Amino acid sequence: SVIESCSNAVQGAANDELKVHYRANEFPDDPVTHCFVRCIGLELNLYDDKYGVDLQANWENLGNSDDADEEFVAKHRACLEAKNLETIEDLCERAYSAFQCLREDYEMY
Ligand SMILES: [Au+]
Ligand SMILES: [Au+]
Numbered sequence: 001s002v003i004e005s006c007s008n009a010v011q012g013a014a015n016d017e018l019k020v021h022y023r024a025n026e027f028p029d030d031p032v033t034h035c036f037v038r039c040i041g042l043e044l045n046l047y048d049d050k051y052g053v054d055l056q057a058n059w060e061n062l063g064n065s066d067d068a069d070e071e072f073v074a075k076h077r078a079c080l081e082a083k084n085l086e087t088i089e090d091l092c093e094r095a096y097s098a099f100q101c102l103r104e105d106y107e108m109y
Helices: 003-007 014-021 033-043 053-063 070-082 092-109
Strands: none
Touching: 003 014, 003 033, 014 033, 033 092, 053 070, 070 092
């Protein structure tokens, strides 16, 4: 529902070629996708513009029900710190940049 609602809440996102990527869980580095990813993130509560990535929620969305491994938290909290998200003015670009920290995780899952 989120994918389909986000393709409509984001301009350009309602696009047959992008949606092909999205369902195949591919997310190209382009301004439409940036906003689509931000939207998914906000809708699923995996993300927030001010507070950033919710690492526990993502841990869950990666097929886990326990408290996140300390490594996982330490790792990505480091990855996200190094991105200086607070200096990225465009919100879609900030969200897209945050979520690349977690890409290795999503892919190996
Ligand atoms: Au493509
Ligand atoms: Au962007």
